[PDB]
Design a protein around this nucleic acid. Structure first.
Ligand SMILES: Nc1ccn([C@H]2CC[C@@H](COP(=O)(O)OP(=O)(O)OP(=O)(O)O)O2)c(=O)n1
Ligand SMILES: [Mg+2]
Ligand SMILES: [Mg+2]
Ligand SMILES: [Mg+2]
Lengths: 686, 105
DNA sequence: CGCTGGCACTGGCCGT
DNA sequence: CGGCCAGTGCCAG
């Protein structure tokens, strides 16, 4: 086993130079540094460990170091270098598994101060090394007079870069041993720093193997990116911008401008009594100024063109134009129109969401009509922000290869689900929401032309059917002997619930069923179905009666975690996952959700892994220079680009086979299924 | 004696006034504005003959102030044939206002 | 008590 | 001004 880390001249997308690397070998117990001219030797050392059936530990190597080395080896040495998946370990992947209840800075991409809770120390250090190194560099320069440019700290190799490289490895080694010391994941009887790769994976908890496989697959997905139709979105942006402008014009006609005090320093005090009046706007008594300018002995002093007069106080003000995006502005104008706010926030502000707006009623028919323009305006902004103007807008993220390479934290959610960001490809507007079709169609395999034939690719969308309800059926099978598990596969469960619950859309039945299943109150249930708390109660009891094993499952969970409870006294604060890991429970009332969401997340995770493996053993190659390419994984759905329709048909069938395999793999008590769709883009494939 | 202006009567009551017009841009929530209010009530009485005192509440009449770059209140604009002859911002005292009016009239 | 997530906007606050 | 940072809401699964 060896522990390594490299320093290169840029992020993966454009790295062209290997600066240095460090290797700590457990069999010699020594550190070895490789500088720029030692690159070939460094790669030799890594491959040697692979030939010994050994292991290579990197911190975030799955997403960076490993792919970077393959790329750099080709560019600089014109060498083929491909460390095998089974030979690599990632302490970041391990940390995220073992310390799943904690956040992390994603290697410095997120500010540490914005994250809730605590952060594991060694990982925090590793995450701050780049910024920390930049500080040293900048200081040393301004210490030498020279100026600091853009981000020159990474342009060339130097001895301070070398030292940081060494510290990263010592810290990574420490992190590794801290994680390996976790008896729950690694049996005490085995020294995992002294075993071959096969022993490492087969002797450690199943979750360790699954997490590394998921991270390796997902890093590949990021590199693939999602073919994106830049042109169509730029055109969408024009359309949205035009509509925004017109709504602004109409709204600013209806709701005119006004003045507000601003920039006042002094306190206004009663001139008579002289007592401070903190409720009055702050004022500003000038010191310079008078009617005339200083002298002129019997010859009219020149008038002071000055706008002020020392002594005479005034209230500084700013002119403000109605901003439809300001909840404050909307609040002000509507109450001024006779609106009586009913519900406020835990801070004294009147709620101004879509529910209230839809219910606001004012006498003036024009303003009454402006409320609909405001609803539209806010929605338009949501679309513009996400597609074009936001900091993480799709248009700011399109790469030169015409794809968006969204990032994925394979195990970012406490339950075992992944998180997505930069931009979040797991929150693209649904095809049935305003502008959804255009948004969704812009992401698609059709937008990628084959590198050889120039023909567009095809898309295969596969989504697990009624995932969490089947997870429920599984866990309550010990209470109802598989009754629900059997009933659930009698026609589509969500469509069936929709009808019985007499709901408008199939999607509405899903939001309802899961809201109900996971503790929504009588009122919240009502809101979801567009009714009152009375209707909420009806559905609650109506569905609980149908399957009383739900209460039984809920009770057993509680009896397993709690012994008494504000504030809670825990018997054990974690659920054992399907693959053996500890799933931290945050609250007794969300426990059932923790159990079901985790099960569904681990099933889907093993599913995408098994699907790709089955495709590979069938002869398909993963990549744009091959047969298929993962473009996105959104909880229980994968979108996959395919070179041909026939390959898409095979991916869809293979995804189903793999799902059934996962179900059998963990002796699930409910049969697991998937639904696949072939098409040119995401609007058609989901 | 004081003229209570509106956005729609501002042009003819002030800009076509043909005479000296002192306009007071104010607001009900301004401390200084409440202070000078009583001073204006008297300045109107006294200067009746060579000057007209008018007030414009910027909340009820939001369209006029912006055209004069109002940055603070109370704002006192002395108009002369549709053109600002002098401007002073602040709760001047009785005497001070008089000094201002005599110096520009 | 729906829960798990990311992220855009406004508006208060502070330092090149 | 541009980072920070609470408040608020909405997008998706
Ligand atoms: N409002 C929602 C929607 C979904 N989910 C969770 C539970 C199911 C999982 C995946 O979502 P869907 O695929 O939308 O649900 P499904 O039950 O798999 O429905 P379908 O059969 O249509 O895919 O996400 C949730 O907690 N709350
Ligand atoms: Mg590194
Ligand atoms: Mg599904
Ligand atoms: Mg889904």
């Amino acid at each position: 086993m060896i522990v390594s880390d490299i320093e290169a001249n840029a992020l993966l997308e454009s790295v062209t130079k290997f600066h240095c690397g460090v290797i700590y070998d457990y069999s010699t117990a020594e550190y070895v540094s490789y500088r720029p001219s030692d690159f070939g030797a460094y790669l030799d050392a890594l491959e040697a460990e692979v030939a010994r059936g050994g292991l290579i530990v990197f911190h975030n190597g799955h997403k960076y170091d490993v792919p970077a080395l393959t790329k750099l080896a080709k560019l600089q040495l014109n060498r083929e270098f491909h460390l095998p998946r089974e030979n690599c370990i990632d302490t970041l992947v391990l940390s995220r598994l073992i310390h799943s209840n904690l956040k992390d800075t994603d290697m410095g991409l997120l500010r540490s101060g914005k994250l809730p809770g605590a952060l594991e120390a060694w990982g925090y250090r590793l995450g701050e090394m780049k910024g920390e190194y930049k500080d040293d560099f900048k200081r040393m320069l301004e210490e030498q007079g020279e100026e600091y440019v853009d981000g020159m700290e990474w342009w060339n190799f130097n001895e301070e870069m070398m030292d940081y490289n060494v510290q990263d490895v010592v810290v990574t080694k420490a992190l590794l041993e801290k994680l390996l010391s976790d008896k729950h994941y690694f049996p005490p009887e085995i020294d995992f720093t002294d075993v071959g790769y096969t022993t490492f994976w087969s002797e450690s908890l199943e979750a360790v193997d699954i997490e590394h496989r998921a991270a390796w697959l997902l890093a590949k997905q990021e590199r693939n990116g999602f073919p994106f139709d830049t042109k169509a979105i730029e055109e969408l942006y024009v359309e949205l911008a035009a509509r925004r402008s017109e709504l602004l014009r109409k709204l600013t006609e209806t709701f005119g401008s006004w003045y507000q005090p601003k920039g006042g320093t002094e306190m206004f005090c009663h001139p008579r009594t002289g007592k401070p009046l903190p409720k009055y706007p702050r004022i500003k008594t000038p010191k310079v100024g008078g009617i005339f300018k200083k002298p002129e002995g019997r010859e009219p002093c020149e008038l002071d063109t000055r706008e002020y007069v020392a002594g005479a106080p005034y209230t500084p003000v700013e002119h403000v134009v109605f901003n439809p995006s300001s909840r404050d502005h909307i609040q002000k104008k509507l109450q001024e129109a006779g609106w009586v706010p009913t519900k406020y926030t835990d801070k004294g502000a009147p709620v101004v969401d879509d529910e209230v707006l839809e219910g606001v009623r004012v006498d003036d028919p024009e303003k009454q009509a402006a409320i609909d323009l405001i609803k539209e305006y806010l929605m338009i902004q949501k679309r513009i922000g996400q597609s074009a103007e936001g900091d993480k807008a799709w248009l700011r993220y399109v790469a030169e290869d015409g794809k968006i390479h969204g990032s994925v934290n394979p195990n970012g959610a406490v339950t075992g689900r992944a998180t997505h960001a930069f931009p979040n490809l797991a929150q693209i507007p649904g095809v049935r929401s305003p502008y959804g079709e255009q948004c969704r169609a812009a992401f698609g395999a059709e937008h990628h032309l084959d590198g050889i034939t120039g023909k567009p690719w095809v898309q295969a969308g596969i989504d697990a059917s009624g995932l969490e309800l089947r997870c429920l059926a599984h866990f309550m099978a010990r209470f109802d002997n598989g009754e629900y598990a059997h009933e659930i596969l009698n026609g589509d469960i969500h469509t069936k619930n929709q009808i019985a619950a007499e709901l408008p859309t199939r999607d509405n039945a899903k939001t309802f069923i899961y809201g109900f299943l996971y503790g929504a109150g009588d009122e919240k249930i009502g809101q979801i179905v567009g009714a009152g708390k009375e209707r909420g109660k009806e559905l609650k009891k109506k569905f609980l009666e149908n399957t009383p094993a739900i209460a039984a499952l809920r009770e057993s969970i509680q009896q397993t975690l709690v012994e008494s409870s504000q504030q809670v006294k825990w018997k054990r604060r974690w659920i054992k996952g399907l693959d053996g890991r500890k799933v931290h429970v945050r609250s007794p009332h969300a426990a059932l959700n923790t159990l079901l969401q985790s099960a569904g997340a681990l099933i889907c995770k093993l599913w995408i892994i098994k699907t790709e493996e089955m495709l590979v053993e069938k002869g398909l190659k993963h990549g744009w220079d091959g047969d298929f390419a993962y473009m996105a994984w959104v909880h229980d759905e994968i979108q996959v680009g395919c070179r041909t329709e026939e390959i898409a048909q095979v991916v869809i069938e293979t995804a189903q086979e793999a799902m059934r395999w996962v179900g059998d793999h963990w002796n699930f008590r409910c049969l697991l299924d998937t639904e696949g769709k072939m098409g040119p883009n995401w609007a058609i494939c989901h | 004696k004081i003229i209570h202006l509106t956005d729609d009567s501002f042009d003819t009551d002030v800009l076509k006034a043909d005479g000296a017009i002192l306009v007071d841009f104010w607001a009900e929530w301004c401390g200084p504005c409440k202070m000078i209010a009583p001073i204006l009530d008297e300045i109107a009485d006294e200067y009746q003959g060579k000057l007209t005192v008018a007030k414009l509440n910027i909340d009820q009449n939001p369209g006029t102030a912006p055209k004069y770059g109002i940055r603070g209140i109370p704002t006192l604009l002395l108009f002369k044939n549709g053109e600002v002859a002098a401007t002073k911002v602040g709760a001047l005292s009785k005497g001070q206002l008089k000094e201002f009016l005599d110096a520009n009239l």
